């Protein structure tokens, strides 16, 4: 039939999840942002549209830090982006508190991944309207 | 409700014309056993604040993590983290004070005596105390435990009242501190000869001296002391 795109956790006949795909649309419509992996670190950059001369220059920082060694930048619904970072900070904090060592980037990546993947499991939630570029330096580069 | 196990003794401090000084030996006792010796009990938060802690060491280590976390947190979404919006001694204290009181109020205290020393953004000297009961207060000089009884009397001779601060130089002050540390080594059976000392000057910043030692002790007269009354040899 049809209407497989009205509820979030629903599988369409061809095995897709339209709600997630529609989220991507919000992402693609957002500002452009990138990440470059150099040989001893990573660089993050992003486009900040001057919607008006009224915006105080330099005053609406987009890139965010998690812990003291991780950087995060995203495109799409900014508020969704902040929400995900808040979770990341909690996750990083929880990890350090028990293992002492600041969270390895690969471990942090899955923490964010499992969390985001979680928002595609129920119709009582909406998927994240952002794609996020993030990384840092750890025990392995 | 608990009872301390591994503990640190006195934490002494005072304030001079430009900043404040704080010190504490490097011992971690276990009852009467002077068990651990490389214990730093002076926690620098940023470089305008130094937190000296005495009491249960496990709780101290815990308060240390809380402080590092505070620094990390303050940095989040804070473009002025190391400028207008950096941690002030007064913030670090108010936080610690809050935590300390909540814990005693829940009948599970952080068994410590804490002194926060530092310099406010406007150059003002900051020096305040808080203990496991949540009690707090300020004075030109502050010391925990054993140091409250022996160090204060000495330090107060240098800065007895407010008008004495501007007349006291870092040399005079640091001297008083170092001498007090010696006196404490003479009469506190839970003290160590090694200690750390830190200066927070509104001009020179934070000077953190590790591995000091009590020097120039008088022990020679000990040879003339024989018996406990009538013995002659």
């Amino acid at each position: 039939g049809t209407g497989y795109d009205l509820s979030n956790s629903v599988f369409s006949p061809d095995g897709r999840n339209f709600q997630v795909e529609y989220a991507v649309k919000a992402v693609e419509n957002g500002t452009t942002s990138i990440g470059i992996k150099c040989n001893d670190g990573v660089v993050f950059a992003v486009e900040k549209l001057i919607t008006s001369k009224l915006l105080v220059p330099q005053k609406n920082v987009k890139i965010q830090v998690v812990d003291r060694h991780i950087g995060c930048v995203y495109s799409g619904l900014i508020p969704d982006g902040r929400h995900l970072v808040n979770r990341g900070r909690e996750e990083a904090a929880s990890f350090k508190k028990l293992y002492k060592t600041p969270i390895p980037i690969p471990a942090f990546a899955d923490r964010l991944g499992q969390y985001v993947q979680a928002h595609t499991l129920y119709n009582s939630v909406r998927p994240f309207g952002v794609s996020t570029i993030f990384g840092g330096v750890d025990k392995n580069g | 409700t608990q009872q301390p196990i591994v503990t640190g003794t006195s934490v002494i401090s005072m304030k001079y014309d430009n900043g404040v000084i704080i010190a504490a030996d490097n011992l971690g006792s276990y009852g009467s056993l002077l068990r651990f010796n490389g214990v730093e009990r002076l926690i620098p938060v940023g470089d305008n604040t130094v937190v000296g802690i005495s009491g249960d060491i496990s709780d101290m280590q815990h308060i240390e993590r809380l402080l590092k976390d505070l620094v990390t947190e303050n940095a989040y979404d804070n473009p002025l983290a190391d400028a207008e919006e950096a941690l002030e001694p007064s913030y670090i204290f108010e936080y610690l004070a809050t935590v300390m009181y909540q814990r005693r109020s829940k009948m599970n205290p952080l068994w410590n005596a804490i002194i926060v020393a530092g310099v406010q953004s406007n150059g003002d000297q900051f020096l305040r105390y808080v203990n496991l009961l949540g009690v707090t207060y300020s004075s030109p000089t502050l010391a925990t435990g054993f140091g409250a009884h022996m160090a204060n009397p000495l330090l107060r001779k240098v800065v007895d009242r407010e008008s004495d601060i501007p007349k006291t130089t870092v040399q005079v002050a640091e001297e008083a501190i170092v001498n007090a540390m010696r006196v404490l080594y003479y009469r506190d059976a839970r003290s160590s000869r090694n200690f750390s000392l830190a200066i927070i000057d509104k001009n020179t910043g934070l000077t953190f001296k590790k591995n000091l030692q009590v020097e120039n002790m008088k022990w020679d007269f000990a040879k003339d002391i024989k018996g406990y009354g009538t013995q002659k040899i």
Side-chain angles (χ1 to χ4, degrees):
Chain A
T2 49
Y4 292 92
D5 69 318
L6 306 172
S7 225
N8 189 7
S9 55
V10 182
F11 274 116
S12 67
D14 44 334
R16 307 152 61 187
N17 180 354
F18 291 97
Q19 269 302 112
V20 167
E21 288 179 36
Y22 292 178
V24 178
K25 294 299 179 180
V27 182
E28 311 187 318
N29 184 281
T31 265
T32 169
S33 56
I34 59 174
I36 305 174
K37 174 191 187 173
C38 57
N39 48 206
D40 85 325
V42 293
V43 174
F44 302 98
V46 64
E47 177 190 26
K48 291 174 63 173
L49 298 177
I50 306 299
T51 291
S52 164
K53 279 284 184 178
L54 290 169
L55 274 51
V56 187
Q58 306 295 305
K59 280 297 174 305
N60 289 297
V61 187
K62 290 187 76 179
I63 302 181
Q64 282 182 290
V65 68
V66 165
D67 200 85
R68 262 130 104 154
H69 64 308
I70 301 175
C72 300
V73 74
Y74 40 73
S75 300
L77 303 183
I78 298 333
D80 282 14
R82 283 187 54 72
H83 178 56
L84 178 58
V85 171
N86 285 159
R87 174 70 190 206
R89 291 168 172 168
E90 289 167 36
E91 216 93 30
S94 130
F95 182 101
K96 182 188 290 175
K97 179 180 185 293
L98 178 66
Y99 309 125
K100 181 50 148 47
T101 156
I103 193 157
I105 296 58
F108 177 73
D110 194 68
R111 283 298 177 84
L112 295 193
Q114 299 283 18
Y115 184 60
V116 175
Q117 186 275 170
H119 288 58
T120 71
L121 293 174
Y122 317 109
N123 62 182
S124 51
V125 298
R126 161 172 78 63
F128 279 88
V130 292
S131 267
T132 312
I133 310 289
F134 65 89
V137 178
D138 66 17
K139 180 239 285 189
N140 303 88
Chain B
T1 298
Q2 43 184 99
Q3 65 161 337
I5 307 301
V6 177
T7 63
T9 176
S10 299
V11 168
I12 71 173
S13 69
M14 72 184 290
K15 54 170 74 163
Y16 56 99
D17 58 13
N18 289 177
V20 310
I21 301 181
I22 187 170
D25 71 17
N26 315 311
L27 178 64
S29 309
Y30 185 80
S32 58
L33 166 60
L34 315 170
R35 201 168 169 179
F36 304 116
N37 267 107
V39 186
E40 180 53 68
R41 304 190 291 122
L42 289 185
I43 316 302
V45 175
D47 41 10
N48 62 161
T49 298
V50 166
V51 177
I53 304 174
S54 59
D56 190 82
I57 299 301
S58 77
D59 285 352
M60 175 185 83
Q61 304 193 321
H62 171 78
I63 291 171
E64 223 191 307
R65 193 176 55 67
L66 286 176
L67 289 169
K68 291 181 182 177
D69 291 351
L70 218 198
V71 167
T72 300
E73 208 86 28
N74 183 63
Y76 291 161
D77 312 334
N78 188 11
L80 299 179
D82 39 58
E84 294 80 1
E85 294 296 352
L87 287 175
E88 280 281 76
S90 54
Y91 307 161
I92 298 166
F93 177 93
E94 208 64 16
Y95 169 65
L96 289 184
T98 293
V99 174
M100 291 311 269
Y101 188 71
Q102 289 175 177
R103 291 292 296 271
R104 88 96 217 194
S105 290
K106 285 199 177 65
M107 294 305 278
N108 177 198
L110 282 171
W111 214 280
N112 303 100
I114 303 174
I115 293 174
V116 171
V119 184
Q120 293 298 88
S121 61
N122 74 330
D124 287 0
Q125 306 104 315
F126 183 97
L127 191 64
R128 202 167 174 69
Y129 166 109
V130 69
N131 60 28
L132 80 186
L133 291 178
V135 182
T136 78
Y137 49 70
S138 286
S139 176
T141 81
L142 292 177
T144 61
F146 208 99
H149 299 137
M150 286 196 94
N152 274 324
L154 297 180
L155 303 184
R156 290 173 182 174
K157 249 154 70 150
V158 181
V159 290
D160 198 19
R161 67 258 313 313
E162 215 65 19
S163 59
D164 285 356
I165 316 293
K167 307 182 185 181
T168 310
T169 71
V170 210
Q171 292 73 191
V172 166
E174 187 179 11
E175 203 164 292
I177 293 294
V178 174
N179 170 258
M181 294 306 283
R182 177 171 41 237
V183 176
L184 301 186
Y185 186 58
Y186 285 148
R187 324 307 284 220
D188 180 357
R190 292 298 174 289
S191 63
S192 169
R193 189 177 184 176
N194 297 80
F195 65 98
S196 298
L197 181 149
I199 307 181
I200 315 299
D201 191 277
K202 68 173 166 192
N203 296 314
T204 56
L206 189 177
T207 304
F208 195 115
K209 310 186 183 184
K210 285 180 127 292
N211 287 103
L212 272 40
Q213 258 211 164
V214 180
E215 307 298 4
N216 318 305
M217 303 183 282
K218 293 196 179 73
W219 284 110
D220 189 274
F221 61 89
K223 73 196 188 311
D224 302 330
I225 305 289
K226 57 270 176 185
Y228 45 78
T230 60
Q231 186 165 297
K232 294 174 180 172
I233 76 185

